[PDB]
Amino acid sequence: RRQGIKKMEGHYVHAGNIIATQRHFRWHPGAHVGVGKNKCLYALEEGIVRYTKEVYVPHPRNTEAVDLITRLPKGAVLYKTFVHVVPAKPEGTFKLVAML
Amino acid sequence: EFKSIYSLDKLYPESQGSDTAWRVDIPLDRLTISYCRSVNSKAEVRFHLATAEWIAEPVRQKIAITHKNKINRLGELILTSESSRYQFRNLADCLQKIRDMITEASQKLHRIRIENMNRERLRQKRI
Amino acid sequence: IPDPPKHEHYPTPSGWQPPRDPPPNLPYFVRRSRMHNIPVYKDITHGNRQMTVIRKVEGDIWALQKDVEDFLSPLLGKTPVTQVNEVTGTLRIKGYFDQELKAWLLEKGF
Amino acid sequence: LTYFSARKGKRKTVKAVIDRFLRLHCGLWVRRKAGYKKKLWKKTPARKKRLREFVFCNKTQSKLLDKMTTSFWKRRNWYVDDPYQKYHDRTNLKV
Amino acid sequence: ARALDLLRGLPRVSLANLKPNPGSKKPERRPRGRRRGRKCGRGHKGERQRGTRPRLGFEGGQTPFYIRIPKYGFNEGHSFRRQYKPLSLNRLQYLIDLGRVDPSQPIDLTQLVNGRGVTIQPLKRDYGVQLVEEGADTFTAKVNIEVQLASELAIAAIEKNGGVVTTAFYDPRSLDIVCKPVPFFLRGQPIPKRMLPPEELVPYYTDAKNRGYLADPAKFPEARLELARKYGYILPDITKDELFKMLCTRKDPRQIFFGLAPGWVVNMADKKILKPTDENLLKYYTS
Amino acid sequence: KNILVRMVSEAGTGFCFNTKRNRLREKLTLLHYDPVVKQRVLFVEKKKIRSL
RNA sequence: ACCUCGGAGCAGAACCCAACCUCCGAGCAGUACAUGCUAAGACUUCACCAGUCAAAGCGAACCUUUGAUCCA
RNA sequence: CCGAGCCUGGUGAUAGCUGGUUGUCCAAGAUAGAAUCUUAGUUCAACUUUAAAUUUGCCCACAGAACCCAAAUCCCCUU
Numbered sequence: 010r011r012q013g014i015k016k017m018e019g020h021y022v023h024a025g026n027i028i029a030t031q032r033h034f035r036w037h038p039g040a041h042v043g044v045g046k047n048k049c050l051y052a053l054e055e056g057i058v059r060y061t062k063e064v065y066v067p068h069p070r071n072t073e074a075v076d077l078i079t080r081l082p083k084g085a086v087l088y089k090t091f092v093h094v095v096p097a098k099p100e101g102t103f104k105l106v107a108m109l
Numbered sequence: 110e111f112k113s114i115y116s117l118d119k120l121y122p123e124s125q126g127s128d129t130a131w132r133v134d135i136p137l138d139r140l141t142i143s144y145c146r147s148v149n150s151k152a153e154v155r156f157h158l159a160t161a162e163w164i165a166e167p168v169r170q171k172i173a174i175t176h177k178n179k180i181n182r183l184g185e186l187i188l189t190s191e192s193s194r195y196q197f198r199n200l201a202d203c204l205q206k207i208r209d210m211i212t213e214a215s216q217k218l219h220r221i222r223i224e225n226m227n228r229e230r231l232r233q234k235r236i
Numbered sequence: 237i238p239d240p241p242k243h244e245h246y247p248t249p250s251g252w253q254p255p256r257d258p259p260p261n262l263p264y265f266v267r268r269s270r271m272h273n274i275p276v277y278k279d280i281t282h283g284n285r286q287m288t289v290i291r292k293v294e295g296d297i298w299a300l301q302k303d304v305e306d307f308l309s310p311l312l313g314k315t316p317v318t319q320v321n322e323v324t325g326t327l328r329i330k331g332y333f334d335q336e337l338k339a340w341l342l343e344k345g346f
Numbered sequence: 347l348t349y350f351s352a353r354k355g356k357r358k359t360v361k362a363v364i365d366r367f368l369r370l371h372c373g374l375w376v377r378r379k380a381g382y383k384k385k386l387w388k389k390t391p392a393r394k395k396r397l398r399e400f401v402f403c404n405k406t407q408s409k410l411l412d413k414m415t416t417s418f419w420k421r422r423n424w425y426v427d428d429p430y431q432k433y434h435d436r437t438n439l440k441v
Numbered sequence: 442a443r444a445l446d447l448l449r450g451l452p453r454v455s456l457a458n459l460k461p462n463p464g465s466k467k468p469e470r471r472p473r474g475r476r477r478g479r480k481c482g483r484g485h486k487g488e489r490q491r492g493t494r495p496r497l498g499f500e501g502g503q504t505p506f507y508i509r510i511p512k513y514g515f516n517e518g519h520s521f522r523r524q525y526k527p528l529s530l531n532r533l534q535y536l537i538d539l540g541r542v543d544p545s546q547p548i549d550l551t552q553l554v555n556g557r558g559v560t561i562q563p564l565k566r567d568y569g570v571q572l573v574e575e576g577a578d579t580f581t582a583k584v585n586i587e588v589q590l591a592s593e594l595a596i597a598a599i600e601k602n603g604g605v606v607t608t609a610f611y612d613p614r615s616l617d618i619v620c621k622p623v624p625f626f627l628r629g630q631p632i633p634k635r636m637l638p639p640e641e642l643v644p645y646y647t648d649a650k651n652r653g654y655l656a657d658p659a660k661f662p663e664a665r666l667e668l669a670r671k672y673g674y675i676l677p678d679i680t681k682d683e684l685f686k687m688l689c690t691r692k693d694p695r696q697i698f699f700g701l702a703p704g705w706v707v708n709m710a711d712k713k714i715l716k717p718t719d720e721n722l723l724k725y726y727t728s
Numbered sequence: 729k730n731i732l733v734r735m736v737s738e739a740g741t742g743f744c745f746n747t748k749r750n751r752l753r754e755k756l757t758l759l760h761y762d763p764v765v766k767q768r769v770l771f772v773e774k775k776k777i778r779s780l
Numbered sequence: 781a782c783c784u785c786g787g788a789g790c791a792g793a794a795c796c797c798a799a800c801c802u803c804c805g806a807g808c809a810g811u812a813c814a815u816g817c818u819a820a821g822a823c824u825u826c827a828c829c830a831g832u833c834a835a836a837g838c839g840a841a842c843c844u845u846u847g848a849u850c851c852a
Numbered sequence: 853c854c855g856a857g858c859c860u861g862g863u864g865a866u867a868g869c870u871g872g873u874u875g876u877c878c879a880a881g882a883u884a885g886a887a888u889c890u891u892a893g894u895u896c897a898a899c900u901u902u903a904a905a906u907u908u909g910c911c912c913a914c915a916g917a918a919c920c921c922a923a924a925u926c927c928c929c930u931u
């Protein structure tokens with residue numbers, strides 16, 4: 010299957026690069042990381058890849074996850090591993106084009 | 110000189126004189142044309158819009174209104190083309206832009222509209 | 237091959253320029269090609285080794301090599317690596333410098 | 347292939363290659379993707395888009411095709427309105 | 442040179458002193474001795490050592506790469522596609538500047554070939570020369586040029602300089618004769634008629650916007666003015682030019698050379714031109 | 729089983745596209761995008777291509 | 781009996797792998813008929829063939845299991 | 853010397869099989885996946901050799917790589 014992480018933490022990544030291929034949601038999309046139909050994580054921006062642990066708040070329409078979260082003790086918080094791309098370059102610059 | 114059945118005089122009897130093949134609106138002398146070998150080169154066409162007698166006065170006014178961003182402080186309309194390696198094609202594009210501007214003079218914004226509407230809504234204080 | 241016609245103004249619209257008369261008094265001379273162009277040629281081997289050859293050199297090919305190194309080191313930032321074929325009278329420079337060398341030889345008047 | 351023909355002593359061209367591949371003069375070979383016309387009703391739009399594409403060959407595939415064609419197929423052709431005229435040459439290539 | 446003085450010093454150059462240039466003669470490798478003998482570079486037993494490995498392109502039984510790819514008409518009709526050698530305005534200006542092409546006379550494919558500005562291969566389906574806009578911005582020559590194809594920008598440059606350009610068709614036979622007339626003259630055959638363009642090419646050569654040699658000359662001034670207007674130059678009145686006769690000279694659509702009629706025989710041995718007078722022959726060569 | 733059928737545009741264009749419908753099911757009429765016309769138009773089943 | 785593909789054992793922690801082997805199911809079904817067109821950048825079953833993901837853009841609306849070429 | 857005579861010719865049949873493959877000296881040089889009427893072969897890959905171009909390469913300290921419910925590995929600033 011040759012699945013798994015393709016870009017480890019700190020790796021420079023260009024927009025569109027696949028970060029990790031997975032069958033389940035082992036790693037979740039963070040900032041500037043999109044998900045394909047097959048749960049592959051790809052970079053939406055050019056920058057550095059970071060892996061963090063973040064509180065998991067499932068989408069309300071996700072009935073199974075909502076049931077899981079409602080069956081949970083009052084103090085518990087779910088955590089998941091998220092992959093973010095810290096953008097490196099700015100969106101652009103203002104350049105003098107003409108001195109009218 | 111040799112002449113066959115397919116000679117041009119036989120093919121087109123109406124036009125037979127030699128001078129018939131060589132007998133000959135924007136004033137190129139009036140326009141100012143410059144070329145910059147900036148890969149595509151650049152052609153700049155500039156002409157004083159106000160003193161463009163070859164353009165009608167209402168058309169000049171409409172052009173000075175619509176294309177005011179392309180008018181220099183000296184009142185001269187400046188427009189450039191950089192879409193070709195050939196200064197011929199760049200100048201052709203500039204001239205076609207001039208023609209299109211004259212023709213239309215003869216005959217992203219959503220957020221700006223919303224923010225202007227909000228400015229008008231905030232526009233309530235009356236001295 | 238016809239001798240090029242005399243033109244009132246040089247360089248000619250195609251950029252061609254006759255060698256100056258009298259020839260420069262340098263220790264070396266670079267003869268024009270039979271088509272009356274400067275004999276500076278790009279060359280490529282292995283698909284990645286780019287070279288430029290000054291081919292029809294007469295006299296002090298070593299003086300020419302010194303001059304070429306002096307002229308090209310500011311452009312490269314390092315002294316260019318060269319081969320001096322004294323037998324065939326050619327100078328081979330690593331890298332493409334055909335346009336710069338042609339202009340330089342024109343300035344020297346070859 | 348035939349390295350020396352029996353009538354001319356020349357090297358022959360494998361015409362199966364000519365019927366299938368386009369050679370760009372610089373040395374690139376272009377081809378269609380296998381199955382690009384087969385059972386399109388059961389293929390996803392992305393797969394069909396991938397299959398409808400003209401695709402370059404490997405270095406070794408290109409070398410094989412070069413060996414299997416003769417020098418006639420590797421010449422400059424100045425066709426009138428060749429769609430591949432711009433692709434016949436490489437630009438801004440470093441090594 | 443010091444090399445000739447060194448020769449003066451050295452012994453006589455004879456057939457016993459000659460040596461090939463070092464690096465021009467690689468040593469021959471032959472399978473004798475420990476290093477190159479024994480298995481002689483063929484390896485251990487197998488097809489490759491026996492010399493019977495399968496044909497090029499065979500992949501051991503797997504369907505080969507060059508066969509598993511679908512057939513596509515990349516090269517269908519390649520040998521019937523017309524080819525036109527490009528002549529850029531840069532190249533034309535270079536030839537004129539170096540005097541290899543004389544602008545004071547009409548420029549046709551014969552003149553281009555004789556000046557070695559272009560190399561035409563009629564056997565390789567070259568149908569002539571196409572004018573190419575490259576170098577238009579620096580073209581400053583007044584020329585009367587006859588080509589087979591011409592881009593709009595190339596025509597514009599030629600006409601802006603005060604010149605004339607016409608697109609004239611040549612069939613393969615006429616093209617071969619035009620490109621190399623001397624071998625044709627040594628063939629000892631009467632000059633044949635230049636054939637008309639094929640039906641697909643007829644509209645191109647009858648269109649005035651292409652300056653086709655079969656186009657109505659009445660429409661030429663209109664097209665020239667349109668190009669001048671489009672590309673922002675004043676159209677020069679070539680009729681006022683002192684070379685107007687040269688600029689106007691155009692060979693007949695059935696004429697291969699400027700001053701020679703179809704049917705004539707060029708006797709180069711005694712510098713003569715035999716002309717048929719039989720009425721049937723004259724009618725045929727004029728038709 | 730299912731059969732592959734050729735839905736042909738009712739807009740007069742020669743545009744046809746292939747769908748799958750049950751053999752026992754009635755002949756198909758379906759709204760679909762016409763690229764030549766650049767608008768959604770009706771398509772009708774013309775003939776059975778195969779039986780899959 | 782099997783031969784291709786997919787899922788699980790079978791590999792504890794990137795990938796790859798215990799082939800042979802164990803079990804299961806697929807040569808599809810359902811859905812939609814933009815479930816379109818294009819296009820940066822990537823993945824990949826260790827070759828190739830093939831197979832995946834995809835920003836931006838255009839256009840409509842407002843997806844969950846296989847087979848090449850030739851030939852017809 | 854007949855489960856199919858002998859001779860000549862096609863014929864230097866063909867052989868993925870067996871055997872052999874001749875001066876001197878130096879140098880670099882190792883097990884490895886896929887497909888295949890394929891596992892006594894071959895083609896691609898990997899490795900290998902030569903030449904060439906260029907600039908980073910290997911080692912790696914932290915940081916980082918999942919829930920279901922061990923030894924180690926990956927990745928890379930330094931060095």
Ligand SMILES: [Mg+2]
Nearest residue numbers: 278279280281
């Ligand atoms: Mg060379």
Ligand SMILES: [Mg+2]
Nearest residue numbers: 475476477479
């Ligand atoms: Mg040895």
Ligand SMILES: [Mg+2]
Nearest residue numbers: 485486871872
């Ligand atoms: Mg042996």
Ligand SMILES: [Mg+2]
Nearest residue numbers: 485486487488
């Ligand atoms: Mg072997």
Ligand SMILES: [Mg+2]
Nearest residue numbers: 010787788790
């Ligand atoms: Mg498995």
Ligand SMILES: [Mg+2]
Nearest residue numbers: 011824825826
């Ligand atoms: Mg792969």
Ligand SMILES: [Mg+2]
Nearest residue numbers: 853854857858
């Ligand atoms: Mg017997």
Ligand SMILES: [Mg+2]
Nearest residue numbers: 491864866867
């Ligand atoms: Mg044998």
Ligand SMILES: [Mg+2]
Nearest residue numbers: 878879880881
């Ligand atoms: Mg050793």
Ligand SMILES: [Mg+2]
Nearest residue numbers: 502503888889
């Ligand atoms: Mg088989």
Ligand SMILES: [Mg+2]
Nearest residue numbers: 488868892893
């Ligand atoms: Mg075998």
